[PDB]
Design a protein around this ligand. Structure first.
Ligand code: HEC
Length: 104
């Protein structure tokens, strides 16, 4: 994926509710630093739904590709109210961006 295009998607569609930087603040949604390789519902200090907490998958490319296409479908009960990203390449670019940004 194209990290620069993914950053732009992040800003447009996610940044209203999420930060990515280490030590970044929780907002409507959790800070996302350290997301990759982590169980659902584990950002310290954020109050998740039981659904988010109990989904019982590990975040990575494959699970993010599915989740971000249709959040409610993947995690019924979630309080992330977001329509999803329809286009595969946009999801790929966004996830490439997140893989970098949530690690650095
Ligand atoms: C507010 C209107 C949000 C928008 C826009 C996006 N997200 Fe979100 N996200 C939000 C909430 C309130 C939550 C917690 C949901 C719950 O049921 O507790 C989340 C959760 C996530 C997660 C899961 C995090 C985990 O630790 O398990 C991911 C990976 C996530 N959100 C990513 C994400 C992206 C990439 C977005 C734009 C495409 C996005 N979210 C939008 C609130 C909101």
């Amino acid at each position: 994926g194209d990290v620069e295009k993914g950053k732009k998607i992040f800003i447009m569609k996610c940044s209203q509710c999420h930060t990515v930087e280490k030590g970044g603040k929780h907002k409507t949604g959790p800070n996302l630093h350290g997301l990759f390789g982590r169980k659902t519902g584990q950002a310290p200090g954020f109050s998740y739904t039981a659904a988010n907490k109990n989904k019982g998958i590990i975040w990575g490319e494959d699970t993010l590709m599915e989740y971000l296409e249709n959040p409610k479908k993947y995690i019924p009960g979630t309080k992330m109210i977001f329509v999803g990203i329809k286009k595969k390449e946009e999801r790929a670019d966004l996830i490439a961006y997140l893989k970098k940004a949530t690690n650095e």
